[PDB]
Amino acid sequence: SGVNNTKKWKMEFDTRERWENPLMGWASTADPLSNLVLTFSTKEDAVAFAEKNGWSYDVEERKVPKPKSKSYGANFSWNKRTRVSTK
Amino acid sequence: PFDNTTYKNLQHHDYSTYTFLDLNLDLSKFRMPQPSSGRESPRH
């Protein structure tokens, strides 16, 4: 339930091939950016960084949970379906 | 006369398994009509 990992903007790159090392079976890669993940305060900072470095990018708008209406009393409604059968 | 030396609550020595619910059945004809939430149950 913690939300502390959803505060900042990230920049990652497209995933590329990983294959099995013949000797050990370890995951090998030829992608030097496979682990590169950058952090930004705002999407404008992230876009600016991407533009000056020549990378083409996709921007996904931040999803924020919408305000919910909560009422403990609704659990015991006289004539509404919200009444709970167990506690 | 007046007496204060005997226990006058001996009827319950003759109560049985269904005494309470039999009385509840008798009381059914005196009750007022129940209110209604407007649905059969919270799951309707």
From Swiss-Prot, chain A:
Region named Disordered: 61-87
Phosphoserine PTM positions: 85
Post-translational events: Phosphorylated.
Cell location: Mitochondrion inner membrane
Transmembrane segments: none
Function, as annotated: Accessory subunit of the mitochondrial membrane respiratory chain NADH dehydrogenase (Complex I), that is believed not to be involved in catalysis. Complex I functions in the transfer of electrons from NADH to the respiratory chain. The immediate electron acceptor for the enzyme is believed to be ubiquinone.
Protein family per UniProt: Belongs to the complex I NDUFS4 subunit family.
Quaternary data: Mammalian complex I is composed of 45 different subunits. This is a component of the iron-sulfur (IP) fragment of the enzyme. Interacts with BCAP31 and TOMM40; the interaction mediates its translocation to the mitochondria; the interaction with BCAP31 is direct.
The protein, known as: NADH dehydrogenase [ubiquinone] iron-sulfur protein 4, mitochondrial
Species for this entry: Bos taurus (Bovine)
Biological classification of the source: Eukaryota, Metazoa, Chordata, Craniata, Vertebrata
From Swiss-Prot, chain B:
Localization in the cell: Mitochondrion inner membrane
Coiled coil, from the record: none
Domain of life from the UniProt record: Eukaryota
Phosphoserine: modified positions: 41
Quaternary assembly: Complex I is composed of 45 different subunits. This is a component of the flavoprotein-sulfur (FP) fragment of the enzyme.
Record function comment: Accessory subunit of the mitochondrial membrane respiratory chain NADH dehydrogenase (Complex I), that is believed not to be involved in catalysis. Complex I functions in the transfer of electrons from NADH to the respiratory chain. The immediate electron acceptor for the enzyme is believed to be ubiquinone. May be the terminally assembled subunit of Complex I.
Family statement drawn from the similarity comment of this UniProt entry: Belongs to the complex I NDUFV3 subunit family.
Name of protein: NADH dehydrogenase [ubiquinone] flavoprotein 3, mitochondrial
Gene from which the chain derives: NDUFV3
Parent-protein start and end of this portion: 66 to 109 of 109
